[PDB]
């Protein structure tokens, strides 16, 4: 019979079964996350087994309909999602070895500890130990010792497993009629079909290259300023014209540069903004924080929170009676059940995290009308970006001053703005080269352009060419540096962050311009604007039902990634950097090495 009707009926059955199954799985996961009990672990394992078995069985019945006979553009995406062989392409021994190696790598990374030499009774774990050493120590030799050690014991012990991991992953990728596993990750951004909105898998690489080729001068000036400022803390350990060694960056891997705020502050005489005192003087609790977030979100025309949200969601840690894992999370259990889990104390950081998670919840609540397979973000970048635009808008001094949390006579000057811009820059702009370099290296490895005996010769050159960091000690083929990261040891992509960073500023500029803002971008509030709320909602409620290009066009107006807002948000910071470093050395050279 009309094949499309049979496919539609199969989708109708799947939608009704999956809802209840997924609800049960999510509820079990929530209950386990709130408490800690062995039988709860057993129940979670059973529920996950049931969910996985149901999904695997329902996948088989979907293979009867070939994809080529469908003219609907809506059921096609659902069938394409369901028709994908999850792990059935491989043989049984292949799956056994793959699961074995994945669990082995995860366990090895999880239980890593280091012992200080000549002290058998003195050992430190990575997170309990090396993080504190890296983040809050001004010493020199100890940092080098830890940096050499952790890599020495981890990379040499994890490289051979990663070799077989790569081999098996490539085997599976070729089995699924793809090019390589990097293509498998690149496929998430693929949209094929509708004319005028094609996006091939290979276009993303060129787009990333072209977009990154523009911010490099700003990164160059910021890096020159950083190197100039570091001459006060390390007078006799920094090369005058060389690249910054990676062992003095305040992190194990150098993902962020946030820990340098107190060392590179432009005008340290005046302290920054912290609203703790007024919060304490009015006896604030979590209820007031969350209702303030609700008021801010309803100010732009978005709906409120559900009645059950204030009842089923915990806001503060119960105490010693129970035992949970304190990590902010917005839960989408489905069927009108939305909850927020966070251990709250009165501080500005939690006040911003509240807005982040509530924006997450609003995005979840936007697309509840779509079918089950379509209930997610347009791609893997929209979600945190929508979360963070609210945070950027809600922490400006004008908003705090208006809502009565600050003195009504509070005189905003042009002296704190440089400090605020530098604080934002050291955590937003200083991380893009790291992500770009890591993704470039990973894609080159998956494609295979780098021979096994010449990995480091290209890895350490890419560092010098992109991040501007040089290794402090010579390394041989025994080391496997990249595997030490959390997202490298575990199977996870890394190109999400670049897209999120580019998207958030584009969204902010569009909303501010449509919101009748006067002045530079950094002093903008998206409040009081239905004009900026309807525009955002036209993108929020689509879900995955439309190509992400069209969803972007309803807000930004352009269907491609843009970089202009990222440079626009830092115009006065760029001006000050240009003024300051007129008498210094520009650029970095690969000539100075501490060991030679």
């Amino acid at each position: 019979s009309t094949i499309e009707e049979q496919a539609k009926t199969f989708l109708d059955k799947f939608n009704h079964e999956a809802e209840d199954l997924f609800y049960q799985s999510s509820l079990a996961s929530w209950n386990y996350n709130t408490n800690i009990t062995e039988e709860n672990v057993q129940n979670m394992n059973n529920a996950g087994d049931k969910w996985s078995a149901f999904l695997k069985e329902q996948s088989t019945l979907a293979q009867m309909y070939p994809l080529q006979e469908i003219q609907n553009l809506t059921v096609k995406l659902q069938l394409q999602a369901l028709q994908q062989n999850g792990s059935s392409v491989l043989s049984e021994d292949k799956s056994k070895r793959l699961n074995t190696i994945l669990n082995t790598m995860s366990t090895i990374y999880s239980t890593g500890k280091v012992c200080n030499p000549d002290n058998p009774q003195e050992c430190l774990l990575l997170e309990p130990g090396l993080n504190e050493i890296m983040a809050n120590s001004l010493d020199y030799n100890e940092r080098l010792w830890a940096w050499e050690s952790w890599r020495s014991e981890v990379g040499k012990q994890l490289r051979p497993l990663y070799e077989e991991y790569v081999v098996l992953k490539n085997e599976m990728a070729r089995a699924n009629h793809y090019e390589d596993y990097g293509d498998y990750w690149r496929g998430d951004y693929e949209v094929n079909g509708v004319d005028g909105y094609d996006y091939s898998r290979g276009q993303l690489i060129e787009d990333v290259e072209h977009t990154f080729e523009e911010i490099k001068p700003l990164y160059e000036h910021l890096h020159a300023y950083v190197r100039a400022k570091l001459m006060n803390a390390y007078p006799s350990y920094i090369s005058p014209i060389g690249c910054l060694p990676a062992h003095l960056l305040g992190d194990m891997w150098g993902r962020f540069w946030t820990n340098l705020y107190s060392l590179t502050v432009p005008f340290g005489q005046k302290p920054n903004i912290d609203v703790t005192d007024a919060m304490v003087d009015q006896a604030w609790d979590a209820q007031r924080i969350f209702k303030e977030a609700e008021k801010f979100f309803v100010s732009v025309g978005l709906p409120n929170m559900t009645q059950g949200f204030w009842e089923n969601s915990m806001l503060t840690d119960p105490g010693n009676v129970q035992k949970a894992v304190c990590h902010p999370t917005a839960w989408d259990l489905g069927k009108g059940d939305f909850r927020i889990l966070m251990c709250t104390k009165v501080t500005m950081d939690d006040f911003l995290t509240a807005h982040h998670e509530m924006g997450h919840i609003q995005y979840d609540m936007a697309y509840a009308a779509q079918p089950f397979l379509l209930r997610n973000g347009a791609n893997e970048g929209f979600h945190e970006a929508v979360g963070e635009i609210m945070s950027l808008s809600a922490a400006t001094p004008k908003h705090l001053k208006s809502i009565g949390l600050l003195s009504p006579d509070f005189q905003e000057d042009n002296e704190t703005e440089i400090n605020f811009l530098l604080k934002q820059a050291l955590t937003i702009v200083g991380t893009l080269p790291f992500t770009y370099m890591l993704e470039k290296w990973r894609w080159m490895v998956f494609k295979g352009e780098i021979p096994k005996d010449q990995w480091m010769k290209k890895w350490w050159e890419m560092k010098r060419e992109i991040v501007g960091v040089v290794e402090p000690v010579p390394h041989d083929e025994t080391y496997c540096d990249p595997a030490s990261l959390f997202h490298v040891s575990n199977d996870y992509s890394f190109i999400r962050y670049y897209t999120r960073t580019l998207y958030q500023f584009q969204f902010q500029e569009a909303l501010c311009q449509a919101a009748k803002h006067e002045g530079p971008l950094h002093k903008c509030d998206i409040s009081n604007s239905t004009e900026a709320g309807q525009k955002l909602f036209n993108m929020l409620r689509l879900g995955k039902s439309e190509p992400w290009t069209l969803a972007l066009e309803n807000v930004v107006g352009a269907k491609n990634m843009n970089v202009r807002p990222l440079l626009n948000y830092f115009e006065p910071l760029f001006t000050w950097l240009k003024d300051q470093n007129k008498n210094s050395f520009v650029g970095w050279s690969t000539d100075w090495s501490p060991y030679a």
Binding site: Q6, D12, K13, E19, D20, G336
Partner: protein, 96 residues
């Protein structure tokens, strides 16, 4: 009206079913109780399993669902003002 307090269970009040599939349309004021297996293809239909489906699917009422999934009891009083005989009874307010 809402009926959460008497139509829900923690495991689930799996006692309400609803029709989902049919190769036909309905007519006003019709009741069907057919439980015959539903055909989707040309092939002969033999029980559940392949494309043949049972044309009855159940609800999943739970106490912590949202407003849009909680049960509302609907009693459709379709009194057509034309019951002629016995119709016209009258509350007939009376006074002193």
């Amino acid at each position: 009206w809402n009926s959460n307090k008497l139509d829900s269970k923690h495991s689930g009040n799996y006692d309400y079913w609803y029709r989902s599939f049919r190769k036909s349309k309905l007519k006003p004021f019709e009741r069907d109780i057919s439980t015959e297996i539903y055909q989707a293809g040309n092939k002969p239909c033999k029980g559940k399993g392949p494309n043949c489906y049972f044309p009855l699917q159940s609800y999943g009422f739970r106490p912590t669902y949202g407003v849009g999934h909680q049960p509302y009891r609907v009693v459709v009083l379709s009194f057509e003002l034309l019951h002629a005989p016995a119709t016209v009874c009258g509350p007939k307010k009376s006074t002193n």
